[PDB]
Amino acid sequence: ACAVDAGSVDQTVQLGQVRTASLAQEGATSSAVGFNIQLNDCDTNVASKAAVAFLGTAIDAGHTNVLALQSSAAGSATNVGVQILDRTGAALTLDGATFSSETTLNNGTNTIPFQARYFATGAATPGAANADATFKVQYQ
Amino acid sequence: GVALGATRVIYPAGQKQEQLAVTNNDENSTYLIQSWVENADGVKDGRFIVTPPLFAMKGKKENTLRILDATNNQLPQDRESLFWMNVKAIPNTLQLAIISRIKLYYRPAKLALPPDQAAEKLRFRRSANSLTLINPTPYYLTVTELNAGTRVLENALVPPMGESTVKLPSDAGSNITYRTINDYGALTPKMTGVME
Amino acid sequence: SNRARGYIPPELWDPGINAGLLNYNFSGNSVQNRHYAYLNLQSGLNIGAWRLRDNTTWSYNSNKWQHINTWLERDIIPLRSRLTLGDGYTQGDIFDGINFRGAQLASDDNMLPDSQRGFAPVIHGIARGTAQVTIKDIYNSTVPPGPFTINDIYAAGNSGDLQVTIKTQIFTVPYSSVPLLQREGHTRYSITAGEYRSGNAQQEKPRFFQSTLLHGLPAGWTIYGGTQLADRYRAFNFGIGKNMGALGALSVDMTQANSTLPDDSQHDGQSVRFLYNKSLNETNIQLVGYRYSTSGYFNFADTTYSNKRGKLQLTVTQQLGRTSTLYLSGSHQTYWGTSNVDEQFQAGLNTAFEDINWTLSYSLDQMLALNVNIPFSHWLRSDSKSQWRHASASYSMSHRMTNLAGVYGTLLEDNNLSYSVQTGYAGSGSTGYATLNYRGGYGNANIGYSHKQLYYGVSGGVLAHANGVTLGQPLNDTVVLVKAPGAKDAKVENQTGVRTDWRGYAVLPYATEYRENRVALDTNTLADNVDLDNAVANVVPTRGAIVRAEFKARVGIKLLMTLTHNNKPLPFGAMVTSESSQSSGIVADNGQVYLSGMPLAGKVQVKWGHCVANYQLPPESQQQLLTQLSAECR
Amino acid sequence: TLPGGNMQFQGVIIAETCRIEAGDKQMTVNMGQISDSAPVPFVIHLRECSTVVSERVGVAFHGVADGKNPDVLSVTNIGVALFDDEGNLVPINRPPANWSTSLHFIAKYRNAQAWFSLTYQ
């Protein structure tokens, strides 16, 4: 019934600058940047709940819940990754079949917010940090 | 303690001002911060102004230093220029005043070679007991990890369009490896030396 | 008592300010086939510490004001929890997530420091003498002789083995992770009372009680219990989870439910949920979630009307070449009575080498997809300032065939104007898409043309605080109200299109709650005539708190003054004050003092430990960025 | 169940200078009264920075020079001499010479302030 908002298909989110002080050892985090997935022309009768599934490359086997960083000729960061959190503050895995917190769909424009941040899987080395993940919207 | 936001500051020509952060995370120390800028030789010069030149910080706090240009377009537009930014944090007995020096790269707009590719274009010349680094790139090169076989050499800084000489032991290996530091303060992966 | 890494005393948390909050979101869809108006309005009042929130919807086809939620949430620091009165929802980690209207008292994980989140075994034991105990380097410090309880181990998920070296008994602490596990000495509780609310009109509205408890016993054990009582449904859930270290982690819970059907018939049932997370092998991470529901087992959702024989989920992830991520997922559901079985298998291979990001996915009817993402930054030099560098190409092919090739990125100075033009083809339908999103300092406006559909939407927020009304981007829970009077058009940092208006008040839509966040005003894009006393502040807001970060700005022209007393530069540390604009400063060196916000003509007062210096400036100095004058003091 | 699209995250990471934390409170090394002399040790800790950045740090001393000897800090007819852990004299007002995250220095008689300069390569 509903259709994902056009423009939300191709979305770019800027995390700003994070100094290496905030990423000391494994488990350290950084500031969070808000973003959302828009939904328009939703019919609640056909589907009443919505969920989002994220699919993306993992930085390492033991940290599948953290994205991987693309190599850059200018020098990308090392042992750092991108972490995605739902509205409940819980980390989301990137296995491709883990639906986030199901949210009740409403008639009209629907917004499902999420958060992104930097997760240090090791010693932090400066450089560019470019990542990308494929998100899937599921209707119930 | 006092801490600088970045290790080196890139100042693009044409931009009015630049920003740099100064942080302190010791909630029980009073710090008088003083700032200034000196030329390549370490002599105080008025070509750059830091605002505020001096102020006071108490508790866990950070301030924003603003760097203003005053060269008034009296510098070349074909090569980068070097300056030294100095930040001092003033707290019988001896008092320890900590002064930190960081690099300031004044970078013109028009440039043929992007900064990333400058590292791979460095050239070497092996003399009898010294090594000379020919750098026809328009960027300052901060060469470290200058390893010569089983003998490691001293780090060096080569200005653009120039050559710098470093000592060379006779037992140093034939192959030479070096690394370059980018604008973010990270070591470029090891690269071999292209002898001419 | 060692404080946890990242702990802030609760007295440093700002409850907020007395303010009215409004969040409007209007959308208009004009579809011309060879008009729908939706409006979502969130009203709110932050009086004292409570947070009154209300949601309203209005629609128009080409008037129906419909309420959605009205709730008063509050934070209780002594109970380390939050209280929700009104229409809310229950997470239901062990039970089923349900919406309701009533009183919910729930513990919160965010209020704890980031160190004490997730699962990480705590290190006990005694170190002889002064030992610099080292954990492989998550933690590195010493400890006085005697028993020590290291509990600052960060949540690292599966990971590997933590080597503990005392300085020398060397013992390792391998550990696994299950979401249902808890740390040692950690208690999570959730009490919910009130009526049940559901979207379906057919379902009844009974009053219910729910209790959920999660306790972390020592040595990697977790005991979790739950009780769901109602007029017709009575269930008790008991579960145990164990960390076996190298072997893995286990969680098993049984729920006994006496449930009454829509008919008067009464049924009894038991359900066993078994969850197993394999440790790291070789590389490969496996999650096995099984649920066996015997005949006669029902949930509270089925009880409030007017079975599942078994469920099996198996997820295997393997990383190869540090680039490719094999994702296998299998779901298999049986049924009671009906012998039909629902199966779903999904296998994906995602690889991102250099800048190219290519993903090939397969799913079972079957569906295969290939996605290629290529940022334009690969080809053109990053030195060039052409806006086209902030663009990327997406090429997708889905097998019916669906091809979609598009360019997308930003082309404005502040990366506010997000543009996306994507041609497509379905096999023969040619339905291209084009969208322009603008995120400015007065609201977000998104307009889209789809080959015909025309979307136009505006989202914004109104804050009625003490110092007037401030308009800004749509508000997301905690909002930071930045107040810098006299500084018009000052862009904040680490956010896109969040600018101060002529009043000088702006709003940061998002700031992490119970955490230290930096609010900085970028002086680079700020007017020369205005100077900020402090361009950075730090605030730690609470859930739904409007915290104010104050920055004082001097509006007069900046000025550097060379002061000499008795033909000699003023001594270091001399205080220079100016009552003309209430400005202050300290002499830096060589009798030079910097002063922000000074009038054209005035007199400054100097205190070495009492002198007056008159000064006047020609109007030409006002047009100059930084003026320097020399004024001998009396 | 329909595909959503791609979502890109972009940012940059920058290093930072090593913070200086002298052992004594407020960086005030108490020496004592005078009737070389008894050694007075002071420690410096370079904290919150990567090892590579910390390694490439040039440490130097400079300050007020005594009239009798420009290589000793001015304070009667005495001065403060600074020695490294190895005990060799480190002259004041000298070019940097790279010397891990914990520095140790000794002061001896033979108040004042000593500009302690850390250049970051």
Numbering used by the authors:
A (entry chain A): 20 to 159
B (entry chain C): 1 to 91, 101 to 205
C (entry chain D): 121 to 154, 160 to 187, 196 to 269, 274 to 304, 310 to 424, 427 to 450, 479 to 536, 546 to 580, ...
D (entry chain I): 7 to 41, 51 to 90, 98 to 121, 128 to 138, 150 to 160
Question: Which text from the study accompanies this structure?
Answer:
The pilus rod is a helical assembly of up to 3000 copies of the main subunit FimA, terminated by a single copy of the subunit FimI that anchors the rod to the assembly platform FimD in the outer membrane. The assembly platform FimD in the outer membrane of uropathogenic E. coli is the catalyst of type 1 pilus assembly.
To explore the structural implications of FimI-mediated termination of pilus assembly, we performed a FimD-catalyzed assembly reaction of pilus rods in vitro similar to the one for the FimDHGFAnC complex, except that excess FimICHis was also added at the end of the reaction. Given the low FimI concentrations in the periplasm (FimA:FimI ratio ≥100:1), we focused our analysis on physiological pilus complexes with a single terminal FimI subunit capped by FimCHis. A 3D reconstruction of the FimDHGFAnICHis complex at 6.4 Å resolution was generated (Map XIV). However, multi-body refinement with blush regularization in RELION-5.033,34 improved the resolution to 4.0 Å for the pilus rod (map XV) and 4.3 Å for the FimI-bound assembly platform (map XVI). The resulting composite model shows that the FimI-terminated pilus rod sits on top of the assembly platform at an angle of about 48°, similar to that observed for the FimDHGFAnC complex. In addition, the comparison of the complexes with and without FimI showed that the subunit in the usher pore and the FimC-complemented subunit on the periplasmic side occupy nearly the same positions when the two structures are aligned based on the transmembrane and plug domains of the usher (RMSD = 0.56 Å). The overall conformation of the usher also remains unchanged between the FimA and the FimI-bound states. We then aligned the FimDHGFAnICHis complex (model XVI) to the previously crystallized FimAICHis complex (PDB-ID 6SWH20) via FimC to assess structural differences.
